[PDB]
């Protein structure tokens, strides 16, 4: 649901679906990940607690040199 969903932006253009999913395993189990051009993505986790963990802990985390923005 919406509570399990997180918007990711700020990724390097070349960062892939695989790489992002791997990174967000530090928030919890990913059930959905969709990557758009320009370093954007939408991710869903198993639980709302995972999504909250992503936003609160992985905010401004670095991925392949780029600083992420999560909300």
Author numbering: 199 to 269
Paper lines:
Kinetoplastid RNA (kRNA) editing takes place in the mitochondria of kinetoplastid protists and creates translatable mRNAs by uridine insertion/deletion. TbRGG2 is a 330 residue protein and contains two main domains, an N-terminal glycine (Gly)-rich region composed of GWG and RG repeats and a C-terminal RNA recognition motif (RRM).
Two apo RRM structures were obtained, one of the RRM(L209M) mutant, which was constructed to aid in crystallographic phasing and one of the WT RRM. The RRM molecules in the two structures are essentially identical; the Cα atoms of the RRM in both structures can be superimposed with root mean square deviations (rmsds) of 0.4–0.6 Å. The structure shows that the TbRGG2 RRM indeed harbors the characteristic RRM fold composed of a five-stranded anti-parallel β-sheet surrounded by two α-helices (36–37). The TbRGG2 RRM structures revealed no interfaces significant enough to provide stable oligomerization, suggesting the domain itself does not oligomerize. Consistent with this, size exclusion chromatography (SEC) experiments revealed that the RRM domain, even at high concentrations (1 mM), elutes as a monomer.
